[PDB]
Amino acid sequence: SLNITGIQSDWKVEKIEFAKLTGERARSAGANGRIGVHGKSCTVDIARITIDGQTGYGSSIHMTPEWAEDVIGRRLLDLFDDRGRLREAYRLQLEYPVLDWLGQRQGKPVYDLVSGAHLETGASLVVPCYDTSLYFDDLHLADERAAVALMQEEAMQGYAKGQRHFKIKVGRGGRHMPLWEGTKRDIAIVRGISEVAGPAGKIMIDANNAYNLNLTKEVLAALSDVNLYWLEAAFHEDEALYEDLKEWLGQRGQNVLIADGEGLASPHLIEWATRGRVDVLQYDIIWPGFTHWMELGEKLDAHGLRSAPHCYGNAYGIYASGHLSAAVRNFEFVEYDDITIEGMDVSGYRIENGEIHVPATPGFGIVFDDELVTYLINRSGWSEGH
């Protein structure tokens, strides 16, 4: 985990500032199984923390000025418990700015701070990613073949920018199209993208809970000849239904992993996973967060389970996920959305051959525009301390 031996006890939180950054994704995202068009506009809530005269930047949620006021003057060491873990009370609000800060101060990327590695460092961090942007962008098209063509073109847009693996939204028949037609269209689209991605491209499908078990089996059977890497959120997680699905997949010799964990998850999901009903856990990279994921990842690794942190709606989480991978053995993929946030320079990262290359620069390797953030803090955000 985190090594905090070189943190001096005199280093205190001097200032906390907050602002909302805005940008856009490269291509507008349509509906998914459960809700309507997501659009192009993106935001990231950011805090800038100052400790011992140095700044760190990162995602911050659930923080008010009044909360922050109470943290000004506290010693950085006191934010950690006896184990070198950031205390629960500070995680959502400050883990990212604090981790970035530690990286800036020590001149190390976060991945080196959290790997717990013993062997000499220096090797570049290269992490598998997948293109998560394949929404229901075809709904304005009545013709199934036209729809497949459009979705193939979207996959090819990602492919030209280095993407090799793709997560395809399915569930069109749950809400937005008639049940049977939408399910037929899901299948055709998945086939179409498979053809684009080729033999080494991993394909995932995400129903946003719009299926039931029999719809799921109908789709999986139809896609027998297609290699599917995982099935995500087929329906709200249920141990009995997944036990059934797993047995069914086994009898068929169909190798598809079951992935779940986003949103308001069952409190028993991990238990179900340890019993073999779910293979890949997808708690979000912002909530419950990075520190939580370090601990969770250790537990999942211990059970031979896989980690694939959810990230959507927050560009910052992409880069966080990349660093988290160094602390988790069975880390699957960074969930990638192509986003440009104003004031948030992520050019140190690049995508090539289905992997994100994480830079070895300090902290999270993201360079914020200090002056723009200051403007946003003052206009619409807030500041505590000095």
Task: State how far Cα 355 lies from the chain centre.
Answer: 14
The residue (of 310 and 357) whose beta carbon lies closer to Mg ion is: 310
CA angle 356, 91, 52 (to 5 degrees): 90
- Pairwise CA distance, residues 339 & 26, whole Å: 6
The residue (of 283 and 316) whose beta carbon lies closer to Mg ion is: 283
Least distance from C-beta 112 to Mg ion, angstroms? 33
The residue (of 274 and 383) whose beta carbon lies closer to Mg ion is: 274
332 touching Mg ion, by CB under 5 A: no
The residue (of 147 and 258) whose beta carbon lies closer to Mg ion is: 258
Peptide bond into 128 cis (omega under 30): no
Residues 138-177 that bind Mg ion (CB under 5 A): none
CB 129 within 8 A of CB 334: yes
Structure tokens at 351: 């995508």
Instruction: Write the binding mask 216 to 235 for Mg ion: x where contact by CB under 5 A, - elsewhere.
Output: -----------------x--
DSSP secondary structure of 310-341: B--S-THHHHHHHHHGGG-TTB--EEE--EEE
The residue (of 33 and 58) whose beta carbon lies closer to Mg ion is: 33
- The DSSP H or E segment spanning 366 is none
Least distance from C-beta 61 to Mg ion, angstroms? 21
Give the CA distances from residue 151 to residues 27, 42, 313, 384, in Å, rounded to whole numbers and listed in that order. Answer: 12, 22, 21, 47
Stretch that binds Mg ion, among 39-47, 258-266, 298-306, 368-376 (CB under 5 A): 258-266
Of the chain, the end-to-end C-alpha distance in Å amounts to: 31
Least distance from C-beta 264 to Mg ion, angstroms? 8
The residue (of 203 and 233) whose beta carbon lies closer to Mg ion is: 233
Least distance from C-beta 306 to Mg ion, angstroms? 15
Least distance from C-beta 231 to Mg ion, angstroms? 11
Among 260, 284, 332, 384, binds Mg ion (CB under 5 A): 260
CB 183 within 8 A of CB 215: yes
Least distance from C-beta 185 to Mg ion, angstroms? 23
The residue (of 231 and 233) whose beta carbon lies closer to Mg ion is: 233
Structure tokens at 368: 């914020």
Least distance from C-beta 206 to Mg ion, angstroms? 10
Stretch that binds Mg ion, among 247-255, 257-265, 273-281, 368-376 (CB under 5 A): 257-265
- Pairwise CA distance, residues 354 & 83, whole Å: 36
Instruction: Write the binding mask 90 to 109 for Mg ion: x where contact by CB under 5 A, - elsewhere.
Output: --------------------
Least distance from C-beta 107 to Mg ion, angstroms? 40
CB-based contacts of 33: which residues, under 8 Å, 6+ apart? 169, 170, 171, 172, 174, 175, 176, 206, 207, 208, 209, 210, 233
The residue (of 237 and 332) whose beta carbon lies closer to Mg ion is: 237
Count of residues binding Mg ion (CB under 5 A)?
3
DSSP secondary structure of 248-260: HHHHHT---EEEE
Among 237, 284, 332, 355, binds Mg ion (CB under 5 A): 237
Least distance from C-beta 338 to Mg ion, angstroms? 25
What is the sign of the dihedral through the CA atoms of 76, 116, 87 and 344? positive
279 touching Mg ion, by CB under 5 A: no
Q: Report the residue number whose CB is nearest to Mg ion.
A: 260
Give the CA distances from residue 97 to residues 26, 71, 93, 129, 216, in Å, rounded to whole numbers and listed in that order. Answer: 26, 14, 9, 24, 41
Report, in angstroms and rounded to the nearest whole number, the Rg of the chain calculated over CA atoms. 21
335 touching Mg ion, by CB under 5 A: no
- Neighbouring CB atoms inside 10 A of 156's CB total 14
Least distance from C-beta 282 to Mg ion, angstroms? 8
Residues that bind Mg ion (CB under 5 A): 233, 237, 260
